[PDB]
Design an enzyme around this catalytic site. Structure first.
Site, mmCIF file in Angstrom:
data_model
loop_
_atom_site.group_PDB
_atom_site.id
_atom_site.type_symbol
_atom_site.label_atom_id
_atom_site.label_comp_id
_atom_site.label_asym_id
_atom_site.label_seq_id
_atom_site.Cartn_x
_atom_site.Cartn_y
_atom_site.Cartn_z
ATOM 1 N N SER A 278 3.419 1.266 -1.919
ATOM 2 C CA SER A 278 4.191 0.950 -3.225
ATOM 3 C C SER A 278 3.821 2.406 -4.099
ATOM 4 C CB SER A 278 3.346 0.119 -4.109
ATOM 5 O OG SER A 278 3.976 -1.354 -3.471
ATOM 6 N N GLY A 279 4.838 2.690 -4.823
ATOM 7 C CA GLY A 279 4.786 3.854 -5.743
ATOM 8 C C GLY A 279 5.160 5.251 -5.033
ATOM 9 N N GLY B 200 0.859 -1.252 0.032
ATOM 10 C CA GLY B 200 -0.032 0.033 0.032
ATOM 11 C C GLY B 200 0.815 1.182 0.078
#
Ligand SMILES: N=C(N)c1ccc(/N=N/Nc2ccc(C(=N)N)cc2)cc1
Ligand SMILES: [Ca+2]
Length: 223
Positions: A177-178, A175
């Site tokens: 991520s990015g 969650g």
């Protein structure tokens, strides 16, 4: 973020939530129209949510702007997560000020040992699952390439770096991520992958943003 702290509302003004009916990834606003995230966060119908602390409550500083396009790195390999970077263009320019602000791209790759701020709304538990409402933060050093490779034999490319703590306990997680790894006010990393979260000798692995600045700039220039 496991073992982090509550950032404080809008203290990470470039942190965005990518939303497709729910938060699914972080991203970093790099100018009024563009967000950098992980390629593995790619999906269609992304709404970028800026200005956001509690992602479950409208608190008054949000800007919700649909993506007009996403551009996954030309060499993104979803198996190895090599080049785990994408650009998301906003349909309209975000309104920038102190609570919503772009983060500078690096001018140079950060070194092992540099402290960074990693942030996101991802799981806060290494075992099991608890998603925070509000943005969580973790100060974490970049780890040496050698320790990174030792931690993850055969998996660390030149486009990745490890950050965090070999002892475990403090890490990004699912969650996140990015989302950003910001070091000295520059986006140096994108939360990419790791083996579980906050596990001993399994530090977070981050997309090495400094490798992509040319691609980011040229992409933005033509899209
Ligand atoms: N710092 C960590 N330990 C850590 C941080 C984020 C994280 N989440 N990534 N999840 C993730 C999910 C899907 C893919 C894929 N489509 N191939 C890749 C990665 C997993 C581990
Ligand atoms: Ca909110």
């Amino acid at each position: 973020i496991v073992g982090g702290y509550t950032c404080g509302a809008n203290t990470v003004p470039y942190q965005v939530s990518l939303n497709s009916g729910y938060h699914f990834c972080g991203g970093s606003l790099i100018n009024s129209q563009w967000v950098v995230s992980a390629a593995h966060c790619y999906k269609s119908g992304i709404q970028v949510r800026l200005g956001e602390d509690n992602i479950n409550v409208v608190e008054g500083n949000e800007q919700f702007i649909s993506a007009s396009k996403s551009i996954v790195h030309p060499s993104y390999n979803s198996n190895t997560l090599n080049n785990d970077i994408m650009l998301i263009k906003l349909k309209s320019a975000a309104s920038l000020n102190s609570r919503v602000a772009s983060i500078s791209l690096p001018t140079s790759c950060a070194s092992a040992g540099t402290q960074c701020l990693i942030s996101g709304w991802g799981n806060t538990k290494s075992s099991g699952t608890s998603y925070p409402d509000v943005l969580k933060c973790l100060k974490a050093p970049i780890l040496s390439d050698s320790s990174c490779k030792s931690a993850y034999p055969g998996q660390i490319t030149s486009n990745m770096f490890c950050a965090g703590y070999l002892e475990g306990g403090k890490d990004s997680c699912q969650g996140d991520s990015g989302g950003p790894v910001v070091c000295s006010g520059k986006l140096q990393g994108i939360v990419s992958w790791g083996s579980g979260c906050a596990q001993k000798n399994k530090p977070g692995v981050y997309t090495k943003v400094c490798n992509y600045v040319s691609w980011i700039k040229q992409t933005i220039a033509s899209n």
